[model samples]
Target: YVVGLQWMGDNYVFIEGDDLVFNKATTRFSAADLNALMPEDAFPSFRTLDAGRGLVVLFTQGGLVGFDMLARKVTYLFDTNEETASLDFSPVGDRVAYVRNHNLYIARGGKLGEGMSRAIAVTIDGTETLVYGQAVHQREFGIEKGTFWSPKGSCLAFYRMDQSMVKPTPIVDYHPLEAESKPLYYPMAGTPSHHVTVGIYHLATGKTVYLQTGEPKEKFLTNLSWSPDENILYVAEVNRAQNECKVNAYDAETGRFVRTLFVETDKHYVEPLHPLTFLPGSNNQFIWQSRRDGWNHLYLYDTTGRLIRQVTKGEWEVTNFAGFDPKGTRLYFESTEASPLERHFYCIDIKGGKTKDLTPESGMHRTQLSPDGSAIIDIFQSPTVPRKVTVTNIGKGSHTLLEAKNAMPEIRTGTIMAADGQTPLYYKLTMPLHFDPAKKYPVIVYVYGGPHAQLVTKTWRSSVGGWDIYMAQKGYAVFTVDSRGSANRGAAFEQVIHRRLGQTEMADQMCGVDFLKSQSWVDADRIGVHGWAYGGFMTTNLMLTHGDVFKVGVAGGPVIDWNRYEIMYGERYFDAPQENPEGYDAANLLKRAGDLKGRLMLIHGAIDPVVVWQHSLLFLDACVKARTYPDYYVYPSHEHNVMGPDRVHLYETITRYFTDHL
Candidate 1:
């Protein structure tokens, strides 16, 4: 299910065929029941949902769950359970796996089994025991599929991270108390990270094997995959600094490294982020994604450590690998070959010989293919049109079924304004619901103004429809701009931010502001801005550097100082802080605190490991030293994200902040 924040019920829901059922109260209702059930207005995405395993799982104030369709009831499959951030369903059976209490649990047979909801702890018996439930900040990320169940459902594989020897970093929060500062196993750049070892458990024998990846002190594991026969296991291992990646295969029984299947290196750090996917029923063999050839493509290899064929090869990168067909002759994938502006579904032969476009010849398209690869549910929208969701065959005709009308009745389309140089900035209007275009309205520029990040799309609506709809319900126009330095334009467009993290991107966003000021319906003095992470950085920078142009700003988990970011990402984009002191100093949002004019609300997780609470603390200190006032809030025992029993509070916070200030 497409889990997302709910607006009304103040909790998550399971979206079935035509019903929106609340997961916490087990309440069943229609879309119209939102206002009555919710304490305040709801976000738009909270109303609609996608199906999974015959139920629709919604992300709301409450935690996760599994709802019954026929019975029209919600089952509490899993809760935060003491600061859990991610959850997944077993591919084979009724077992539900979730990360909680800094450990992985396989709750088998759930409530459906005969009073035996067996639960097994995967991270137990480790040298480095979990201190505080996986540290909320690091929980949301790297938990997508930390635990993989064998296709047959007999074996379970998970990663055991040991950080007992690593020194902790300080995390300061704004709790209105003078308590002792906490020490977090942050494992920052040049620091010894948590040692990772893969362990597999066989339910049949209650036997487990720990697969070692050389010396465990400063290494990490990725691309973990299991063969179809469950006799072999594979993991891509990288060093603590993320410079080198090597594929290590192991015997499932002995847990011994059989051999190194592949190796890759780069001048700068490379990401072994993509997981490996084995072909249907293939033993000790799999398809891997790599950019070793200077372009991302698929490489097929046999168990004997021989290259079988290059599945995909071209100048363009494979955006995402959907799945393999049953016959294994073709692979379904999304690529930028059609147009970098939009992603389209395509199929290519295993031998890298034939390629076909399975989508319509229209604006940028995004689709999800069924498991069999025979059909795809396409949800498409562009700047010129509204959303159109359809189901179409792989090699046949279009099956147009659902055409979503514009939730915002009014829209504002403006001309592409010329920038400082020769660059042009285009605009699309998300007018307020039932908009009378002639009236003046407040505008919020939803921005991701960072290197390689694109907010502008060819879609008629924003992908985060919930937030957009909620803003419109409050009579505000939402706007997004694909800044000049954003992705898909070219390698140069993204590289322009090198050595200057916040310079080029901010200029592009101002170009967008210039276009907004040109509109007669737009209230120039009532413009606000908001975004998360990198976008958070942008929102903060804009509010501090050009506070006069922005009336309100919400910076969510932002990076106030780039010097503390990860090595692989930080060095590649902005080089080391030591090497570019001037650039780093110029990019510091804290230094410009004295110029702040807008009503800025800085929101962050108390345990956020990625950006860290230190960033927020340093910025707040700068504001205090400069006597600059700013609003702030923190979610306790929460990581980089806040998603349960308090998510609506988050929405209410953002909405109220913008409503009062903008």
Candidate 2:
């Protein structure tokens, strides 16, 4: 019944349940009866606490509401009327920073967010085209946040992106009485990319310093890290090609370039998704995650650009870096050292020696190390286990806090070799609850054969959702394959789709199809596909390239052409359209629209900025020219992905398509 657990000194707080518990003590917040404190229909969440943990903030429709955990009194902090976002609290617990109207601002408060004073503007000239403290590069390179708070909260480093040169794309809004449009600064591949820079603001001096990330100004300024003393900052600067990365150091006070710690290069793409994680008390040494040895591992390095050693090694990758012990000797992390399909908690010395599998259970053991690092609160789930919560002390045993009841029906998992005959591809299947091998069943290939997502992990019900379960219960077979481009399979497996985005994925997915056709209960002629985003791209590709194999498909928010995709993601995979015209042409669904023989239905959000509405429109336009008729639908109120109650409508539409056609 508890989730979102976090360590606050010797006590721990549950963000989901809104409870604080310590040694023989427990305190409950207003979450159990928040409706009395706020509106009944209003949405509320315990966002985060101030540095001191005395106050907790909840994001409500009114504003950022603060509550003292002990006193249980609510205080209205600030309102987000002018499109405010990216809320962050300083380390000293007295100040908070946020972005409003594309500009960054900091506000001081008393008693940890109570009685917050007027805001102080960090940037005055910020406009829509010139944005500050907002997500940049279309959220690529693992750059999720724009602001970086220094260790002591004395300084703040934020991202500034100038999109003046990048063209604005208008998303058609069909909601208005007439027609309306929202202009988005969309930097497409092969187009004029945005110029990005970093700004450092000193609270005491009330001045800002822009980092001299000069030259092309189109390169990615990713993975920002600050030294312990708060004097130097490290940035993993990547080139436009995304093939090279240089970990560069800069002076925090002056924003002057110091030295490049190390450089990494790859023929495919050098992706730096994490910042240099400095140890708790170490000012010089830190751990860096990279695919230097063909696998994502931890590398110990110093600020002086010296490689001390490779901390974690081998074929398996380090999944998560759980911070060091208070003394900075023992290090804990989550890794696939046990198996790629499941993640396990591990303990290793900072000097690098034998590792201890803290959680040897076969599941996704996501750990949260306590403040002192002697214990961990583990949130785990496996193929059999619904959800298990445990608190385990290092070098000791574990105690399960909650073991969620398992209502998940059985499913089957299998591994098949890819078309390359070397690599293994994992697939999961769900059949009718009362399945009979004698009767043939129509199959739906639920696919998401793209990078950054692996559908066939060893989790609850093998990661199959309600839609898949419902399909099987309705006498249909649901199947999914994690092919070459699927994540957690290492670089070489995923990078094969580079330049030719769907070619290898298609071949591997067809391998699963071949396996399905060879099966006794599968009806070969009744195979269909369903996916969104990259999976949408895969669904459309499979429907077109192998039209005779797949009879029906539902593709949502698919990328018909890579040129229309964003610069950071598209350039990394397919490169620029001008640079890789052949690759683009081969994967372009528009070019192959004439070959569509299946009953293909393309669904798109009318105002989707991610894949854009143009992708499916262009494909539909091409189908018209080719005299090929395909079904089309649009969600006017949704975005790139559909969610909430409306998702049921999407699932119903997709299900009806298969039941009627397949």
Candidate 3:
């Protein structure tokens, strides 16, 4: 029966038609039409632990549950007693591998936990510098988690990263009993990086074996996946150079390296993100995604590393890949084929060389392919549509499931010629809610001109929002650009900034500034800029190099120097500091502190491991040496980005700076 109630003892709930009841409350407990009790914040993406069997795993903020949608049953798994990181479930959902205390653990009897929670330690020796089952290689090359489960729940493969020999950066805290220092084992470029290894644990035998990956030890091990029978484990290993990737297989129980399946190499760098999608019923054929031809597309291959054919080919890249149809004749994927500014889902017939767009309407589309491969839940939004969710009966059509009201502001789009003067760079502009072209207004150029990133897109609320809306409501205009070196336009567009990080991007942004100056509504002399990370680097570079253009700027957790950045990302873009001394010198803000002519404020997280605190601290020190005036602020105990309730503080501080200076 349908249930809709504001408060049911501690949980507030609402019913959609008859079967489902969703709670929009803070009770931390939600009811699914009493069909199942669920955690309030289930992981944003609905992850099916075993898609073939309709078994899904839900990660609660404090617990874990195996949700069998087929039976409408919720099986309690592990109840987390401490703050944890990655939560991984076996295909059968009977065992779980999770990270706690920086070490990996496999718990027993959690399948139907009613006083059956037995936790077993997989690795006991975990020091601060020697980590287990946590992210490695600075979470680069698509390394999101550290654990891998075998297909049958018999063995678990995990990562072991040791940075003990590397030098540590002291994260100083002033809120201590006095002032205190916490050591952060951050690896800088050209320095001795972490040593990584793969280990396999057999559940039944209680024995562990290290993969005979051998040698350099600094090589990054990523893209961990399993063979159909669970006898083999696959890893996409990239050398310290990041210019080459080799998909290698290892014997699961023995942890012995098998022959390398294939080797992909590029002059700039090779990035391997997608897992090998093997055919559902057969182990012979698997699909691989690559940019070998400059645009990301799919390739069919036999297990012997023999290329069968290029399944999908186009100038646009395939953004997402869903598994094959039940019979394995067709595969589904999402791509920018419709437009680089939008994403559309499509199904392709492997041998027939035919493709069909499932979601043809324009906008940014995200989808959840049905387990049986018969349907999809298409959720999309465009300039006209706020947010719409629809269920498509594949081969038939879709029906609207939900539609949210429009929350539009006066957002607009325009294109400008790049610094090259031939290529087009698209930009988005958010004007003041109440617009009067006669009256001039201040503009904040928000920039994030980095590789594999696009700031402008064709979507609802425009490409940039949130702070853009708040600043727009405050009588200021916000602008962003997807310049050269940004993603989705292909390799030539993205790899243009190689070895020279900020030069081309800044030149393209100046074109955007020129566009803004030509508009009568824009106050050119009062323009400001802001960005974080690469964007942060951009904001600071603009303030120093083009001192006459921007009046003020804010840079958050910025990378002050490429030498101080991590190896994976830094080495890919600008090579090693020792290798590219000239390029590094050109972008070093510390050396050019005397050139700062704007009111620039550098904000940083105290323990930011990515772009360490040393980045901004060194710039501030250089400023002191040059007698240059620049403001600095820090968020104590925060890292990379200031988030949560403190995010409001971060933005409010940023918002206040423009009002005060610009």
> Which is the leading candidate under TM-score?
2
Candidate 1 lDDT for residue 181: 66
What does candidate 1's lDDT look like per residue over 1-662, in tens digits?
24321322223333554565554215666644432333213322421222333343335554444444334444334343433344555555355566665566766533322244447665554333443123221332133456677777777777666667567766665465774566767654434446667778776787888885678545666666777877778777776445578878888887888998777786544556566677887675578877666556788888776778788877666778887888787888887777655677889888788678787555677777664456666767766656666666666777664465434445554545435576555555677886775798899988776654655555555555467668888988888776765665544445667778878788878888877888798899899998878888989998887878998999888988777665445655676677678888898887888877768888988878777877877888899999888889988667777777787888889888998889
Sorted on TM-score, highest at the top, how do the candidates line up?
A: 2, 3, 1
Kindly list the per-residue Cα lDDT of model 2 for residues 197-310, writing each as its tens digit: 999999999999989877888879998888878999899999988899999999998889999999999998898999998877788889899987778888899888899998
lDDT of 3 by residue, 434-476 (tens): 8888899999999889887887887877454388888887888
> In model 2, what is the error at residue 409, expressed in angstroms?
5.7
lDDT of each: 0.67, 0.83, 0.81
lDDT: which candidate is best? 2
Q: If scored against the real structure, what TM-score would every candidate get?
A: 0.72, 0.94, 0.91
Q: Per-residue lDDT for 305 in model 1?
A: 69
Pairs that collide, model 3? none
Q: What's the TM for model 3?
A: 0.91
What are the root-mean-square deviations of the candidates from the true structure over C-alphas? 8.1, 2.9, 4.8
